[PDB]
C-alpha cells in the first residue's frame, strides 16, 4: 500500500515487517500467600517482635478488605429465573463505579464460590513451615500455600539458635520483618485504593513473597513455548480474592493467556536516515511505526508492546487514529511531510535494506574498492541509492559492504522529490510556536474585520 | 457549578467528589547513620579489606562535604541588634543560590548548633556493635546510631569463622561491602550535588542502610494513623546536617508533616465513555480532574499526588492554570469541547454513576429482563441514561445491573447536544498538523497583502 | 455447535493414540480448541489448548514433551497424539471450544462448548 520507494528519498527505509499478536482468552488458578511466618521451631528467642508486626501489618490489610467488601456482599444470586443463569448486583448500593471494574465485581463473586473450599483449611494453612507446601483442598483437588520469609527463619536463624545470644536472634530477626515491610509497602500501601481491578501483574503481586515470582509460577504446572514472552508483555495478571484478618494471608487467583495472531494486519517499522537539502542535513518527522489492518492505516502507541524480532506481542489493542494530512505522507504525498533541522554532530547517516544501501554521501565517504573511484552526490539529490549494479562492493566510512540489486525503478539516483515544510519539535519551542501563529493570525484577522466595518 | 448533564451528554459522567489535602508544619529529629560496620569481633580476617573500603568510600563522602561547607562557614549569627535575632548570610560569597537552597541555608545552621552536641559522642559511635543502638546525647536527651552491616556480619559471619577458612571469611566479607557500594552510589553519587536541599524523599536516604526505612521511621517514635499516607505520598524528608571523614557516619534530620484539609476546595474526578456520532465512536477530550477552589475552576497536574477512596494527598500545591476556551466546556458551551476518534476495538462503553447507567447502546447488547425487550439508540443519540423508572434491571453484555432513579431533567433520552471540533493528540500529529494550519494561513495572508498592495 | 471425540479405546503401556476431534459450522476458524480429562475419581484436569491458527500451544506440565496437539482449519479438526501412556493416563477425554475474546481478562457467561467425551485406558 504506502509507497516506500518515492517515501525513501525523504530520509526513510523499509523496516522489517512484523506481525501483530495479542492476549486471550485467560486460565485460572486459585494460589495463597502466607504472609507471616512460622516460628515454634525457636519461639523462646521471638520476644514481643511478633506482636509489633501483626499490629502493624494488620493496619495495611484491613484497608483493602474494607474495599473489597462492597462488591462482595452487596450482590446475589439470580433466582426466580431458568432462561439465563447469573448474578444481580446492587447498583443503587455500589454507586460509582467503572465498567472494568463492575466487571470485575462479577468475576470475584464467581471465584469465592472456589475460594471457600480453602477457607476451610484454615488449620492446616497456620501449621505449614516451608517456603512451599502441597495441601489436599479435598481428595479431588490441591492447593499451594506460599510463605514469605520461611526459607530464612529455616536457613540463617534455626542453626545458629545455639552461638548467637538470645537477644541478637531476636534482633536478627526484626531486621528481616523490617526489611520484608519496607519492600511490601510499595505494591500493597495506599496506592492499591482498587484491589476489585484484575489488572494487577502478577510481578507486582509477587512482591508479596520476595519477588521470586518464578516460582510462584512454577507451581501452576502450566508449560508452554510463550512463557517468557507472556511474562514480559505483561500478560500474566493476579486478583485478590481473599484476605483473612485472623492469619494473614490472601488468596489470589491468576490468569494464564494463550497468544492469538490478528487476521490481516501488521506493522511496519520505518528506518530514518538524514538526508541533504540545501547544505543542511534534515530528518523527516513521521511515525517510526505504521499499523495496517484490513489496508486501512493507523497509529500505534508502541511503547506499552513488546517488539521482538518477529512479532509485537500486546497486552491489549493498542491503535490510536491519524490525521489525514499525515497519511497524505504515506500514500506518496511526500509534500505534506514534516521535516526537522539536523544540528548535532553524530546523527545516522545510511541504513542498509534488502542488501541496498541508501546513504547521505554528502556527510559520509561512500566509495566502492571495485574501482576505487569516490561516490559523489550533488546538492540536488537528497540520497544516494548504491546497489550491485553500480558497483559490487562499496566503503562507508571504513565498513566494507558487498550489495544486492534494486528491485524498483532503475533511475532512483537521478530522479529527486518535492520536499516538505520545517518543524520543530521540543515542548519550549512548541509552547513558543502556538503564540507566534496567533499573533500572525490576529494581524490578519484585524484587516478583514476593519474592511468589512470601516468600508462596509 | 459546573454544568454536569449537559456535560454527560458528550460522554462524561461525574465521579467521586474528593478532599484536598496537603502536608503542613512538620516536626525535627535528628539522628546519625553509621556508613562502615564494626569487625572487631573477627578482625584478624578482615585483612586490607577495610583500607580499600575507606579509600574509596571517603572519595564520594568528600564531593558532599565540599558542597556543604559554603553554607556552613559563609554565615554568622547577627549581632548588635535585639529587635531582631537571626542569622545574617554573606550573599557576596555565597554568589549564585535559588530561593529555597538559600532558605535551606538558613535551616541547616539552625540545626548545626544540636547536631554540636552528637558530635561529643564521636568515641562512642565508633565503638558501636549493633543494627540499632541507643546512645546517650546527655542525661538529658538521648540519639540513635542506625549501623551498615552489622547484623550481616554479626549473623553470617561471626558463627561460621571456624569452619570457613580464614581467606573465603575475608572474600564473603568483601562480596558483601562491594554490592553494599554498588547500591549506595545511586543515592549518594554525583546525582546529589545539592545536600543542602531539604527536599529529599526519605526513602532514598535510607539506602545508606539497606532501605529498611520502616526501622529508620519506627525509632523516631512518632504513632499517627496517617503514616501510610505520609510515607507515600513523599511527604517525609530527611537533610544532611554533618559529615566527618574520619570516622564515615552522617547527621540526617528527619522532617515529620501533619496534613491539613484545605477549605473549599475539592476535586471532581470525571469518567469518560465512549459515544456515538453519525456512525463513528468518539471520545470527548477535557482534563479527568477537575480542581475547583472557591468557584473557581483550574487544572491540576494530579501525577504529583497520592488517589486515595476519599481524598487527594499532595506534598505541596500543584495547581495550574486552563485556557478559557476548554472551561467553556465545563460551564456548559459543549461547541468547544475537542473529541478524538475511536479507533481501537476496545475502549469503555458504559459506565455507572448515583446508581444510573449511562450505556452506548450502539455497541453493547442494552436490554433489560424485566420485559425482555432490548433497548435502542437512534444515530441522533449520543448515549442512553437507563433508570428503574424505563426499566428495573438491565443487563450489558452479561452483567446484570439493579437500578436507582435519575435526580435530573426527566427528558434526558430526549434532547441531543451540540458536539463540537475534532482533535488529533498524537505527539508525531501535533509536529505535523502545526505545519498544515501554518501553510493554511499563508495562502491566506498572502492574499490580503496582494489586495492590500496591488490594488491599494 | 456440536463436537465429538473419536479414536478412543485400550493400548498397552508405552503405546499411542491419535484423539480426534471434529467440528461442525463456518465458524471454526476462530475457536481456541482444548482437551480435559477426567480420570476416576479425580476432578476435571486440564491437558492442552491451540489457538485458532495452530501457532501457538499450551499444556500441562505433567504432559510436557509427552504429547502433542494440532489443529487442520480445512478438514475442522482437533488432532491430540500421545505417546508412551502410562497407567495413570486412564480417563475419559473431553474436547472443548472456546470463541476467541481479548481485552478484558474476564468475560461474563462466555458462551463455552463441550464435547461427548471418549475412553482410553492403558494395560499393564
Known amino acids: 500500500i504506502l509507497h516506500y520507494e518515492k517515501l525513501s528519498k525523504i530520509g526513510l527505509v523499509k523496516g522489517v515487517t512484523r506481525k501483530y499478536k495479542i492476549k486471550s482468552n485467560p486460565l485460572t488458578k486459585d494460589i495463597v500467600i502466607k504472609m507471616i511466618p512460622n516460628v515454634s521451631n525457636m519461639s523462646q528467642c521471638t520476644g514481643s517482635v511478633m506482636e509489633n508486626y501483626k499490629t502493624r501489618l494488620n493496619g495495611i490489610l484491613t484497608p483493602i478488605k474494607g474495599a473489597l467488601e462492597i462488591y462482595k456482599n452487596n450482590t446475589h444470586d439470580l433466582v426466580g429465573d431458568v432462561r439465563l443463569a447469573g448474578v444481580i448486583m446492587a447498583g443503587v448500593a455500589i454507586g460509582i463505579a467503572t465498567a472494568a471494574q463492575i466487571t470485575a465485581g462479577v468475576a470475584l463473586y464467581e471465584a469465592m464460590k472456589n475460594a471457600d473450599n480453602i477457607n476451610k483449611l484454615k488449620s492446616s494453612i497456620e501449621s505449614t513451615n516451608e517456603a512451599v507446601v502441597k495441601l489436599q483442598e479435598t481428595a479431588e483437588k490441591t492447593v499451594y500455600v506460599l510463605t514469605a520469609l520461611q526459607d530464612y527463619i529455616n536457613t540463617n536463624l534455626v542453626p545458629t539458635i545455639d552461638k548467637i545470644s538470645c537477644k541478637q536472634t531476636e534482633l536478627s530477626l526484626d531486621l528481616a520483618l523490617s526489611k520484608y515491610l519496607s519492600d511490601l509497602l510499595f505494591v500493597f500501601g495506599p496506592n492499591l485504593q482498587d484491589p476489585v481491578s484484575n489488572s494487577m501483574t502478577i510481578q507486582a503481586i509477587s512482591q508479596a513473597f520476595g519477588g521470586n515470582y518464578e516460582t510462584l509460577l512454577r507451581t501452576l504446572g502450566y508449560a508452554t513455548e510463550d512463557f517468557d514472552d507472556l511474562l514480559e508483555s505483561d500478560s500474566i495478571t493476579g486478583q485478590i480474592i481473599y484476605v483473612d484478618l485472623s492469619s494473614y494471608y490472601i488468596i489470589v487467583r491468576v490468569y494464564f493467556p494463550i497468544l492469538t495472531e490478528i487476521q490481516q494486519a501488521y506493522i511496519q517499522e520505518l528506518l530514518p536516515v538524514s538526508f541533504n537539502n540545501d547544505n543542511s542535513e534534515w530528518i523527516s518527522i513521521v511515525p517510526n511505526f505504521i499499523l495496517v489492518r484490513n489496508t486501512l492505516i493507523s497509529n500505534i502507541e508502541i511503547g506499552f508492546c513488546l517488539i521482538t524480532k518477529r512479532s509485537v506481542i500486546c497486552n491489549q489493542d493498542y491503535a490510536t487514529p491519524m490525521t489525514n494530512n499525515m497519511r497524505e505522507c504515506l500514500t506518496g504525498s511526500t509534500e505534506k511531510c514534516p521535516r526537522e533541522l539536523v544540528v548535532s554532530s553524530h546523527v545516522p547517516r545510511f541504513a542498509l535494506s534488502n542488501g541496498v544501501l541508501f546513504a547521505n554521501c554528502i556527510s559520509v565517504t561512500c566509495q566502492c574498492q571495485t574501482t576505487g573511484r569516490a561516490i559523489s552526490q550533488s546538492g540536488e539529490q537528497t540520497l544516494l541509492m548504491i546497489d550491485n549494479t553500480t558497483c559490487p562492493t562499496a566503503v562507508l566510512g571504513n565498513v566494507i559492504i558487498s550489495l544486492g540489486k534494486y528491485l524498483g525503478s532503475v533511475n532512483y539516483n537521478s530522479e529527486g522529490i518535492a520536499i516538505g515544510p520545517p518543524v520543530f519539535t521540543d515542548k519550549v519551542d512548541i509552547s513558543s510556536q502556538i503564540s507566534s501563529m496567533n499573533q500572525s493570525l490576529q494581524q490578519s484577522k484585524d484587516y478583514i474585520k476593519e474592511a468589512q466595518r470601516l468600508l462596509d | 457549578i459546573l454544568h454536569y448533564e449537559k456535560l454527560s451528554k458528550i460522554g462524561l459522567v461525574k465521579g467521586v467528589t474528593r478532599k484536598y489535602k496537603i502536608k503542613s508544619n512538620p516536626l525535627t529529629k535528628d539522628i546519625v547513620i553509621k556508613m562502615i560496620p564494626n569487625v572487631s569481633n573477627m578482625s584478624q580476617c578482615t585483612g586490607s579489606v577495610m583500607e580499600n573500603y575507606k579509600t574509596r568510600l571517603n572519595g564520594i563522602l568528600t564531593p558532599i562535604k565540599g558542597a556543604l561547607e559554603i553554607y556552613k562557614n559563609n554565615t554568622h549569627d547577627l549581632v548588635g541588634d535585639v529587635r531582631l535575632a537571626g542569622v545574617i548570610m554573606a550573599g557576596v560569597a555565597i554568589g549564585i543560590a535559588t530561593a529555597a537552597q538559600i532558605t535551606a541555608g538558613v535551616a541547616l545552621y539552625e540545626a548545626m548548633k544540636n547536631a554540636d552536641n552528637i558530635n561529643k559522642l564521636k568515641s562512642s559511635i565508633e565503638s558501636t556493635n549493633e543494627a540499632v543502638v541507643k546512645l546517650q546525647e546527655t542525661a538529658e536527651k538521648t540519639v540513635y546510631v542506625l549501623t551498615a552491616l552489622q547484623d550481616y556480619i554479626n549473623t553470617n559471619l561471626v558463627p561460621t569463622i571456624d569452619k570457613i577458612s580464614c581467606k573465603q571469611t575475608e572474600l564473603s566479607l568483601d562480596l558483601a561491602l562491594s554490592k553494599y557500594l554498588s547500591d549506595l552510589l545511586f543515592v549518594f553519587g554525583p546525582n546529589l550535588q545539592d545536600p543542602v536541599s531539604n527536599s529529599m524523599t526519605i526513602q532514598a536516604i535510607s539506602q545508606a542502610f539497606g532501605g529498611n526505612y520502616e526501622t529508620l521511621l519506627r525509632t523516631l517514635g512518632y504513632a499517627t494513623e496517617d503514616f501510610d499516607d505520609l510515607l507515600e505520598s513523599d511527604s517525609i524528608t530527611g537533610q544532611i546536617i554533618y559529615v566527618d571523614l574520619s570516622s564515615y557516619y552522617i547527621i540526617v534530620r528527619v522532617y515529620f508533616p501533619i496534613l491539613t484539609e484545605i477549605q473549599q476546595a475539592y476535586i471532581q474526578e470525571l469518567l469518560p465513555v465512549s459515544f456515538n456520532n453519525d456512525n463513528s465512536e468518539w471520545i470527548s477530550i477535557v482534563p479527568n480532574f477537575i480542581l475547583v477552589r472557591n468557584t473557581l475552576i483550574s487544572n491540576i497536574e494530579i501525577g504529583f499526588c497520592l488517589i486515595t477512596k476519599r481524598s487527594v494527598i499532595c506534598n505541596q500545591d500543584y495547581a495550574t492554570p486552563m485556557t478559557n476556551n476548554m472551561r467553556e466546556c465545563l460551564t456548559g458551551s459543549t461547541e468547544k469541547c475537542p473529541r478524538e476518534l475511536v479507533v481501537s476495538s476496545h475502549v469503555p462503553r458504559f459506565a455507572l454513576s448515583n446508581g444510573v447507567l449511562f450505556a452506548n447502546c450502539i455497541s453493547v447488547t442494552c436490554q433489560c429482563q424485566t420485559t425482555g425487550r432490548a433497548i435502542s439508540q437512534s444515530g441522533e443519540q449520543t448515549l442512553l441514561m437507563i433508570d428503574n423508572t424505563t426499566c428495573p434491571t438491565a443487563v450489558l453484555g452479561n452483567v446484570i445491573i439493579s437500578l436507582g432513579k435519575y435526580l435530573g431533567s426527566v427528558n434526558y433520552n430526549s434532547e441531543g447536544i451540540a458536539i463540537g471540533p475534532p482533535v488529533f493528540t498524537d505527539k508525531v500529529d501535533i509536529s505535523s498538523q502545526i505545519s498544515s494550519m501554518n501553510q493554511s494561513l499563508q495562502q491566506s495572508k498572502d492574499y490580503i497583502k496582494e489586495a492590500q498592495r496591488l490594488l491599494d | 455447535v456440536q463436537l465429538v471425540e473419536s479414536g478412543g479405546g485400550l493400548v498397552q503401556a508405552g503405546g499411542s493414540l491419535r484423539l480426534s476431534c471434529a467440528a461442525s459450522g463456518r465458524t471454526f476458524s476462530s475457536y481456541v480448541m482444548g482437551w480435559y480429562r477426567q480420570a476416576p475419581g479425580k476432578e476435571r484436569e486440564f491437558v492442552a489448548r491451540?489457538?485458532?491458527?495452530?501457532?501457538?500451544?499450551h499444556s500441562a506440565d505433567s504432559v510436557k514433551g509427552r504429547f502433542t496437539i494440532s489443529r487442520d482449519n480445512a478438514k475442522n479438526t482437533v488432532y491430540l497424539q500421545m505417546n508412551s501412556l502410562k497407567p495413570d493416563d486412564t480417563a475419559i477425554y473431553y474436547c472443548?471450544?472456546?470463541?476467541?475474546?481479548?481485552?478484558?481478562?474476564?468475560?461474563?457467561?462466555?458462551?463455552?462448548?463441550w464435547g461427548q467425551g471418549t475412553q482410553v485406558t492403558v494395560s499393564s
Open positions: 491451540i489457538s485458532w491458527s495452530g501457532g501457538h500451544t
Open positions: 472443548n471450544a472456546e470463541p476467541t475474546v481479548t481485552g478484558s481478562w474476564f468475560t461474563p457467561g462466555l458462551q463455552s462448548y
